[PDB]
């Protein structure tokens, strides 16, 4: 699961091997630049302290004219110029070193990740169909996104900051042992707890978001399950139970979040307590050593400061090890993909290529099974020999594998037994790509790339001019719809052929295959949705180009099969019947039976959502008022310690003031712990119950909505669970964290500036000039430490959706062998974010080094002006130290706090969208009782002139004014083509869509005036695909009846009536057996039977069936239908199915054609007048 670190950096140039070495040398040199500034700070404060001690003695005596005072402070004013030169030198060196190290590591990352990305896509276009069938399609795309982002975050910049932190730690210890070791051993005795506190501080500062998603992991399943099955759920009326289950999950999630917030804030409070207790110990022992007359004050400042910076930087080194371990663990998979090579190399030019390509097909003893399900053997040997120009058709029921034979032809796989050959030699020694280009194949359901149609028809082969394009499309007879639409070669077809119709799509797909000019043509169901005349002209064109080529046609319509060369028949995988038309006529087999039968708006109204919980906000604002003013208190106490140690006094007065301030540090630590814990707890509680109540109300206002609001292209299931998962937790940052951060920063900086203006005026004005660049020096470094920006990966994947539409449409391009064109398209689509990445890699280094140098230059300028002010006697050294300490440390605290907060602008926009969802009222209300409530009914339905257009497809009408008359107990079958408005009449009944025109009378009562929930209560259906919920089977069937005490005798009675009682009573924990998502554990016929049992508990007066025997056994269809036939009396029953067994015994039968009712009446009347329903009956009987 992990790679070694030697193999991790293997795709690198000499230039990146130089970039990494120079960017770690400059990282060490930049890392050794803070303790070297502590040396200068110690020696400068020692100069200031020694001049000051000397000064008092001269003062009482007086009478010394001017030179004596001059010379005493002129030595100070002269020596501070040399120390300002030292500071400026360290500042310039740190500027150059930090720019070089950041820029060179980010350039090494950019070049390496570009080569990784190109090699991974080039390897994934060598990987067979079988690997796609075993692994995934969507997890592959998230593997690309996640693994590239994790490599870029792993070897990107964190390897530089790790070496910088190691250099800072080692330089700090070397300085702390070379100045004074007796203090460094005390702080080294402390320093494990210091490093542990810093490590856990950076740890819980790093993640900050994963606990919310692992708390919502248990509740989002119910969300995605209900939003996936929205129409069936509001068709049953089970809003209330799923609402209560969502509540039961959210209470647990909120309680674990409460525990998380309390524990994290206690941890950071204990971190602050340990920092200030380390100050109290360090300065108590330091002033013991100074008043002993053994150290100076500058020696104590240098050793302690140098030691503490080293310990916290080696603590802050901790996230880089985690990021690098994650990069190794994410790199192993991409290295596994780019390592392994298949047996069938689709780019090896060591394949063999024929020249005299003559059409001849040889199959002998061909056994093959799918590697997805290898336990089942579909094929048990097929032997064929097809000559040139021989139109071979294959007939049989669905399940024998005509599509299997087509996929076996193009070498998408290999047969486990035997040997296949094309014109003498076998496929197993000759080239795959040259063979793949010469076999033009149309599959069953083609896919069309969403480019212009000229490029689509160009996609067969490289150099095709428009004259061959026009000849091919006129052969395809697909020029009329080209002529009527604008942009006749410039029309961008939408996603998956949604812009055009199906017949135009299949005709231009035939064109797209014919532009290759192939040697063998293979059609698979080429006229599924096509009409009469266009299939006729397509088949005439197919016979126009069949004389030089070998052809195999698979189709259901026998109009295009009767004019073929050889007809054959599959049975159990084995080709059983052979010969021409009349040979199978006199053979009297299954084909004889077949032919015998056939003849923004929110502006701080986000506080309105949380006006109810005022006391949490009151104690939070109070604790932020206190906890903002703990940097100026630290400025006061630190400045007063050094102001004690500049002037002369008694030894006992110095010891008293030193002990008092080394106690005031510890008092500040305890107050910091208490107020920080209390603020963090109360803002955690307010934000958490805001997230809980807003998730509840957003879920309920989602569930009140119409079906037609859920079919919107902007309102998808993924977008709604994003608006419930990601954006519900983003509304706490617009109010609670915003008030905490604004109040904390005001009491951090305003009182520091006011104290500074009272004590020293001129220096406060100069520092107010230089202050915003130090604040930006806080925020930019804190943004670099923990996730600066993630828009570049979004731009990357938005340009790289070519990869997604290449992987999703892999089934066409493995036939077209057009891999190299897609690889070069990806290589030329990566090129612009490459330049954007290099531009960002220079600009970020420039601005980071500008702020990092402006810190040291602020030190130099502030202390030179303070030296002048002390020398001309307008303030003291205690006051310049107070002004500088308060303003600069307040600015860095403002940066470090205001970078920790989440953003406010996107939080405000997300709150505006959540308020948009909350405020909206649907056109119908499921909770209202108003309408027509009659006490009685009969059960007669009358449709008249009903037209319906889909709201997502307003230009395409699926209905053209149907009408229907249903009476009591009338088994009404609805037969038609796939996609002619079969479930549309169900959706018109169940109050999903209300039609724009038409009239529907339910027993002389119009449905538009009735109660909405009453119609949804009385009837009960079975879905087109059975969906169950994440519980047991007792709660699967128990969902059928709601607002009612569900009796278990009805449960076992319905399980016996649906003949699912056996499969339930066989299972261990029989009525408590936990079923996963959508019934993925148990089989399809069993969940179809439990869907029958779930509809059966409703006892509906109106019953609808939509494909009641899609996947079900022949003995199970009778035991399903016996309960139906004993219970079809009393209730109106309407069954829609493709199997004719429930259609023969039906009462009245209605055939549809493009939405229009063609034939209606009794079954014998439709069997008398031979129309289209006779051809529907003529399928497989006899």
């Amino acid at each position, epitope marked *: 699961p992990t790679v070694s670190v030697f193999s991790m950096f293997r795709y690198s140039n000499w230039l990146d091997k130089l970039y990494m070495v120079v960017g770690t040398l400059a990282a060490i040199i930049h890392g050794a630049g803070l303790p070297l500034m502590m040396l200068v700070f110690g020696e400068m404060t020692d100069i200031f302290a020694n001049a000051g001690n000397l000064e008092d003695l001269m003062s009482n005596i007086t009478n010394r004219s001017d030179i004596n005072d001059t010379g005493f402070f002129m030595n100070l004013e002269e020596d501070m110029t040399r120390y300002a030169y030292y500071y400026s030198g360290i500042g310039a060196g740190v500027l150059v070193a930090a720019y070089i190290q950041v820029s060179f590591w980010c350039l090494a990352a950019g070049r390496q990740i570009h080569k990784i990305r190109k090699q991974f896509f080039h390897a994934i276009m060598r990987q067979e169909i079988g690997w796609f069938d075993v692994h995934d399609v969507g997890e592959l795309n998230t593997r690309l996104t996640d693994d590239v982002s994790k490599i870029n975050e792993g070897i990107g910049d964190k390897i530089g900051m790790f070496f910088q932190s190691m250099a800072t730690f080692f330089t700090g210890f070397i300085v702390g042992f070379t100045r004074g070791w007796k203090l460094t051993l005390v702080i080294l005795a402390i320093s494990p707890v210091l490093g542990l506190s810093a490590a856990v501080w950076a740890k819980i500062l790093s993640s900050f978001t994963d606990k919310e998603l692992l708390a919502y992991a248990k509740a989002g399943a119910v969300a995605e399950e209900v939003l996936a099955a929205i129409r069936t759920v509001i068709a049953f009326g089970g809003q209330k139970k799923e609402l209560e289950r969502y509540n039961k999950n959210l209470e647990e999630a909120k309680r674990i979040g409460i525990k998380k917030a309390i524990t994290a804030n206690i941890s950071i409070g204990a971190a602050f307590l340990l920092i200030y207790a380390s100050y109290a110990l360090a300065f108590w022992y330091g002033t013991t050593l100074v008043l002993s007359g053994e150290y100076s004050i500058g020696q104590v400042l240098t050793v302690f400061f140098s030691v503490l910076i080293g310990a916290f930087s080696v603590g802050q080194a901790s996230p880089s090890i985690e990021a690098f371990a994650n990069a190794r663990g994410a790199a192993y998979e991409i290295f596994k993909i780019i390592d392994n090579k298949p047996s069938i190399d689709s780019y090896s030019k060591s394949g063999h290529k024929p020249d005299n390509i003559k059409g001849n097909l040889e199959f002998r003893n061909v056994h093959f099974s799918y590697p997805s399900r290898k336990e089942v053997k579909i094929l048990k040997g097929l032997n064929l020999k097809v000559q040139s120009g021989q139109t071979v058709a294959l007939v049989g029921n669905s399940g024998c594998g005509k599509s299997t034979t087509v996929q076996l032809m193009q070498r998408l796989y290999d047969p486990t037994e035997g040997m296949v050959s094309v014109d003498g030699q076998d496929i197993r020694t000759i080239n795959v790509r040259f063979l793949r280009e010469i076999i033009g194949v149309v599959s069953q359901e083609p896919v069309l790339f969403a480019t212009t149609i000229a490029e689509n028809i160009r996609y067969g082969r490289e150099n095709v001019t428009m004259d061959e394009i026009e000849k091919a499309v006129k052969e395809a007879n697909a020029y009329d719809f080209i002529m009527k639409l604008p942009h006749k070669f410039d029309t961008l077809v939408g996603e998956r052929g949604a812009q055009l119709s199906g017949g135009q799509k299949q005709r231009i797909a035939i064109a797209r295959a014919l532009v290759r000019n192939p040697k063998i043509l293979l059609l698979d169901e080429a006229t599924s949705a096509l009409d009469t005349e266009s299939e006729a002209v397509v088949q005439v064109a197919l016979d126009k180009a069949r004389k030089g080529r070998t052809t195999i046609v698979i189709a259901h319509r026998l109009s295009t099969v009767r004019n073929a060369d050889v007809i054959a028949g599959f049975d159990d995988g084995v080709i059983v019947e052979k010969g021409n038309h009349d040979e199978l006529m006199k053979e009297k087999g299954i084909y004889f039976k077949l032919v015998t039968m056939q003849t923004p708006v929110s502006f701080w109204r986000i506080m309105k959502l949380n006006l109810t919980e005022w006391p949490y906000f009151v104690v939070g604002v109070f604790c932020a008022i206190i906890n903002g003013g703990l940097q100026p208190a630290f400025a006061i106490i630190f400045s007063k310690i050094i102001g004690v140690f500049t002037r002369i006094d*008694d030894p006992e007065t110095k010891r008293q003031n030193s002990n008092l301030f080394s106690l005031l540090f510890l008092a500040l630590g305890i107050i910091s712990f208490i107020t920080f814990f209390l603020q963090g707890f109360t803002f955690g509680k307010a934000g958490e119950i805001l997230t809980k109540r807003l998730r509840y109300m957003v879920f309920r206002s989602m569930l009140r909505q119409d079906v037609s609001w859920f079919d919107d292209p902007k309102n998808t299931t993924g977008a709604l669970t994003t608006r419930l998962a990601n954006d519900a937790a983003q509304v706490k940052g617009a109010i609670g964290s915003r008030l905490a951060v604004i109040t904390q920063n005001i009491a951090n900086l305003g009182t520091g500036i006011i104290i500074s203006f009272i004590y020293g005026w001129q220096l406060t004005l100069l520092l107010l000039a230089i202050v915003p660049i130090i604040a930006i020096a806080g925020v930019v470094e804190m943004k670099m430490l923990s996730g600066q920006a993630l828009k570049d990966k979004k731009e990357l994947e938005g340009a790289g959706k070519i990869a997604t539409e290449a992987i999703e449409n892999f089934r066409t391009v493995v036939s077209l062998t057009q891999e190299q064109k897609f690889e070069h398209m990806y290589a030329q689509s990566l090129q612009v974010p490459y330049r954007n990445s290099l531009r960002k890699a220079h600009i970020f280094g420039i601005t980071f080094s500008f702020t990092q140098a402006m810190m040291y230059f602020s030190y130099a300028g502030c202390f030179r002006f303070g030296a002048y002010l002390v020398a001309h006697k307008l303030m003291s050294f205690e006051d310049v130290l107070l002004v500088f300490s308060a303003v600069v440390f307040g600015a860095m605290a403002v940066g470090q706090v205001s970078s920790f907060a989440p953003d406010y602008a996107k939080a405000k926009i997300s709150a505006a969208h959540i308020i948009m969802i909350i405020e909206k009222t649907p056109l119908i209300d499921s909770y209202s009782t108003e309408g027509l409530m009659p006490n009685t009914l009969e059960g007669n339905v009358t449709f008249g002139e009903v037209v319906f257009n889909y709201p997502t497809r307003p230009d395409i009408p699926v209905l053209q004014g149907l009408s229907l008359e249903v009476k009591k107990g009338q088994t009404l079958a609805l037969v038609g083509s796939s996609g002619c408005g079969k479930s549309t009449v169900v959706q018109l009944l169940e109050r999903f869509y209300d039609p724009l025109a038409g009239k529907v009378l339910l027993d002389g009562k119009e449905i538009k005036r009735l109660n909405v929930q009453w119609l949804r209560a009385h009837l009960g259906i079975v879905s087109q695909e059975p969906i169950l919920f994440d519980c047991s089977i007792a709660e699967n069937i128990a969902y059928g009846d709601n607002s009612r005490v569900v009796s278990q005798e009805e449960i076992v009675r319905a399980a016996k009536e649906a003949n699912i009682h056996a499969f339930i009573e066989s299972l261990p924990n029989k009525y408590s057996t936990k079923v996963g998502d959508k019934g993925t554990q148990l089989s399809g016929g069993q969940k179809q039977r439990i869907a029958i049992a779930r509809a059966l508990v409703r006892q509906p007066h109106i019953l609808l069936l939509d494909e009641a025997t899609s996947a079900l056994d022949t003995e199970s269809e009778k035991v399903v239908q016996e309960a139906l036939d004993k219970a079809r009396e009393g209730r109106t029953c309407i069954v829609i199915a493709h199997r004719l067994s429930t259609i023969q015994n039906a009462d009245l039968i209605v055939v549809f054609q493009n939405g229009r009712v063609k034939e209606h009446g009794t079954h014998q009347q439709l069997l008398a007048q031979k129309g289209i329903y006779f051809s529907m009956v003529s399928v497989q009987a006899g």
Partner: antibody
Amino acid sequence: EVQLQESGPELVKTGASVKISCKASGYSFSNYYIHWVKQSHGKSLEWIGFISCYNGATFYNQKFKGKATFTVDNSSSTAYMKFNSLTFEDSAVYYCARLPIQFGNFYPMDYWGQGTTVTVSS
Amino acid sequence: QVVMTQSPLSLPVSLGDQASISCRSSQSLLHSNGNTYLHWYLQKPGQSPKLLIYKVSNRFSGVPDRFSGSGSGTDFTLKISRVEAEDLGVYFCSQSTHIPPWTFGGGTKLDIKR
């Protein structure tokens, strides 16, 4: 162990120039002042001046300004006093004593040298 | 300039009893604090002047428990109780708390009292 020790006796000529040296050993040399005081034969001690012993800022009594000069040496950690233009009145015994720079003037001169003895003759 | 005036210039103590030396200022040696600074040194013949008492009541470290200072204002006293054969040599009294004349005292020898 804190020990300031000085040079041996001198036997200079009148009008010459002499240099006497207080070498400090056993403590951190860079904090404490060095005060040079003078005892004649059978009189009270008299304070000559002090040298700051960190950077080298001197301060002399008004009787002795110009006829004495203090230097320091941080490498070997000594303090030198140079007399120029000796007369007979400058024949005495000279002592060096330290005094801490943090709480200066509120602390006694706690450690004293053994004192050199300068004998001006002609 | 203040001038200390150490009142005996000889003090014929015996061997094994009490002796008292008395420093006496010319100005009130009370600082603006509550403290009074005058320090008492012993000087042996030919060796370095050790320190005995500082800030008249207190005591240095290493000096035995016989010596004790007292007095205030402008009248200060050192007292040796049970004088041994080791405490012979002059005793002088620094300082002025008004510096930089930084004055000193005369001295007081001790005898054997024949």
